[PDB]
Amino acid sequence: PQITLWKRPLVTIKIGGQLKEALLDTGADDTVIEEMNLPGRWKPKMIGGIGGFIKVRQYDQIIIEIAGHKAIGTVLVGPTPVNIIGRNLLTQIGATLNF
Amino acid sequence: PQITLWKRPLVTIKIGGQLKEALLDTGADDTVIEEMNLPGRWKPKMIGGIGGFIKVRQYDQIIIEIAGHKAIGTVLVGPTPVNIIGRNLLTQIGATLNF
Numbered sequence: 001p002q003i004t005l006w007k008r009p010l011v012t013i014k015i016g017g018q019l020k021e022a023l024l025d026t027g028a029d030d031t032v033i034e035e036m037n038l039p040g041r042w043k044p045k046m047i048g049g050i051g052g053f054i055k056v057r058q059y060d061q062i063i064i065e066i067a068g069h070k071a072i073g074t075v076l077v078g079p080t081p082v083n084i085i086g087r088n089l090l091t092q093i094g095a096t097l098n099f
Numbered sequence: 100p101q102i103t104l105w106k107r108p109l110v111t112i113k114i115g116g117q118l119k120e121a122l123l124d125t126g127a128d129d130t131v132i133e134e135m136n137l138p139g140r141w142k143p144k145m146i147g148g149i150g151g152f153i154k155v156r157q158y159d160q161i162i163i164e165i166a167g168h169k170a171i172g173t174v175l176v177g178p179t180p181v182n183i184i185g186r187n188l189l190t191q192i193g194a195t196l197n198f
């Protein structure tokens with residue numbers, strides 16, 4: 001698809017047999033989601049947006065479907081107001097910013 | 100242009116007559132630029148993201164050249180870690196996400 005930006009670029013994501021919603025975010029390096037009791041070991045990490053820093057849990061090798069497209073990568077889990085698909089997964093689905 | 104997301108989508112912008120560098124951010128409703136002086140009256144505003152809220156001065160109807168494309172719209176001046184072009188101006192230059 002070609003998604004204009006008049007509203008938030010929200011898509012359906014599936015991760016661990018749970019359908020959720022996420023923002024296609026060109027300004028996020030990493031993918032940040034709410035808790036979904038992800039399987040596997042994790043590492044603690046700090047991330048920051050405008051407003052300061054949050055404590056997150058880093059899970060690698062996570063399988064996720066983004067608007068139908070299958071992707072695999074690092075998903076950080078922490079207190080994020082909205083679920084965020086960062087460039088790290090956006091590149092996997094071939095997402096580009098065009099104008 | 101078509102911009103892949105293997106690195107931060109940074110572009111040259113011109114604002115207040117100054118050339119600056121800024122991030123094309125589809126996850127941002129608003130445009131947030133580091134401390135600079137701009138013409139017209141501003142109003143005090145608080146914007147939120149990950150980590151919490153910051154205080155910005157809101158200027159309306161600011162002319163801005165994003166990667167050679169003129170746009171007019173609201174610009175928030177504040178203590179941002181990086182200059183951010185939000186959807187409010189991305190829509191002004193016809194930017195779309197594509198995959």
Ligand SMILES: O=C(O)CCc1c[nH]c2ccccc12
Nearest residue numbers: 142143144145154155156157
């Ligand atoms: O003092 C300033 O220079 C601006 C203060 C300011 C900007 N946005 C704000 C929001 C709430 C309270 C104060 C502010």
